[PDB]
């Protein structure tokens, strides 16, 4: 379908959010209309936030599907996350001409328990 999604917003990478709380990323399609193209995503629990990010433990996953604006999609955890460091990893779909990269990471997001 010649779609082309990039991460345009997310849960803020600065600071630490009191847990448990959901995490999200917004993807903007700047290509042709997303039709049946499958952009797989994974929410990883990381060991650390050092760059470039490293694959961790996949906590949740899915495919980009929920349209929230004319060319805007949102991915959001259905669990609320426990304390930790996390990031979304979004893979290119079958047929995509991967020149730069086969995936895109969000910036990392941190949660910690406040009420103890």
Residue numbers in the entry: 75 to 190
The authors write:
Bacillus subtilis expresses TasA (translocation-dependent antimicrobial spore component) as the major biofilm protein, which aided by TapA (TasA anchoring/assembly protein, YqxM) can convert into stable oligomeric structures to form the biofilm matrix. In summary, TapA consists of an Ig domain in its core and flexible N and C termini. TapA thus functions as a chaperone in analogy to the chaperone-usher pathway since it already has a complete and especially stable V-set Ig fold and has the ability to complement TasA in the process of filament formation by donating its previously unstructured N-terminal strand. Owing to the stability of the TapA Ig domain, it is not able to open a cleft to receive a donor strand, and thus can only be located at the beginning of a filament, acting as filament inducer.
Deleting the N terminus resulted in TapA75-190 that yielded only negligible amounts of oligomers in an AUC run with equimolar concentrations. The additional hydrogen bonding suggests a higher stability of TapA71-190, which is supported by the TSA data (Tm = 60 °C for TapA71-190 and 46 °C for TapA75-190). Structural integrity is supported by a disulfide bond linking C92 and C188. TapA44-253, TapA54-190, and TapA75-190, on the other hand, appeared as monomers, since they contain even numbers of cysteines.
